[PDB]
Amino acid sequence: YAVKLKTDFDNPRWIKRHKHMFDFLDINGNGKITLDEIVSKASDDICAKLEATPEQTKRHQVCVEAFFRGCGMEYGKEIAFPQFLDGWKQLATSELKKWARNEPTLIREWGDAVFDIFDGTITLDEWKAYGKISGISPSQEDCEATFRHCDLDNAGDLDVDEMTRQHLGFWYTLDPEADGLYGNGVP
Numbered sequence: 001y002a003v004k005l006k007t008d009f010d011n012p013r014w015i016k017r018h019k020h021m022f023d024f025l026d027i028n029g030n031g032k033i034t035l036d037e038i039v040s041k042a043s044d045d046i047c048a049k050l051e052a053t054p055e056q057t058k059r060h061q062v063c064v065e066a067f068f069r070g071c072g073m074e075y076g077k078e079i080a081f082p083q084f085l086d087g088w089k090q091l092a093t094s095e096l097k098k099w100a101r102n103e104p105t106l107i108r109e110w111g112d113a114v115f116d117i118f119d120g121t122i123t124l125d126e127w128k129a130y131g132k133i134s135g136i137s138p139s140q141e142d143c144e145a146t147f148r149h150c151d152l153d154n155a156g157d158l159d160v161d162e163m164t165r166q167h168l169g170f171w172y173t174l175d176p177e178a179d180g181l182y183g184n185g186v187p
């Protein structure tokens with residue numbers, strides 16, 4: 001499968017995918033999120049529960065900051081969904097230009113940081129833990145779906161190169177080959 005490179009930013013399914021994620025981040029239901037909250041979730045919550053080392057936590061935070069700044073987030077800046085989505089259009093565009101130049105993307109680099117906390121492969125049990133800890137996929141069945149969906153290595157583990165290809169399609173281009181990456185956890 002060739003990763004779908006053309007964007008599809010007006011497709012209701014792409015909007016819905018990010019609306020789901022925004023509302024997931026908007027825990028207090030007030031329609032706005034900040035980079036502060038995202039970084040706290042990354043560092044104070046996820047990395048702590050994963051027992052990341054201090055250096056791994058810091059690297060992961062740099063990647064989360066860069067990723068979400070790429071969608072227009074900033075500390076102290078309260079962003080609502082329409083502006084957030086507009087930021088994702090910009091991030092996707094930028095990321096696809098990097099991909100075309102064979103320059104590591106911000107989604108790759110975030111992946112590298114996540115994978116390194118799990119020791120560039122992750123096992124299904126590690127993915128299940130991530131799903132619960134990050135909250136993106138707390139159903140272990142949806143995590144099993146991710147592994148069924150992806151092309152796995154010879155051990156049945158997931159590699160960051162494959163997850164990055166999947167994430168380009170899932171988060172940026174609405175690639176049909178990426179549908180179902182998170183099972184039913186994320187539409």
Ligand SMILES: O=C1N2C=C(c3ccc(O)cc3)N=C(Cc3ccccc3)C2=N[C@@]1(Cc1ccc(O)cc1)OO
Pocket residue numbers: 017018019021022038039041042046064107108110111112114134136160163164167171
């Ligand atoms: O991709 C991922 N995410 C995308 C969004 C997200 C958020 C908003 C959107 O509109 C769309 C997507 N939110 C979270 C969860 C999270 C959010 C904030 C801080 C830390 C973690 C998240 N975790 C990741 C981490 C990851 C990255 C690359 C890999 O190869 C493997 C794992 O795997 O799912």
Ligand SMILES: [Ca+2]
Pocket residue numbers: 025026027028029030031032033
């Ligand atoms: Ca909020």
Ligand SMILES: [Co+2]
Pocket residue numbers: 120159161
């Ligand atoms: Co490799």
Ligand SMILES: [Co+2]
Pocket residue numbers: 151152153154
């Ligand atoms: Co194979």
Ligand SMILES: [K+]
Pocket residue numbers: 147148149150151152
């Ligand atoms: K598979």
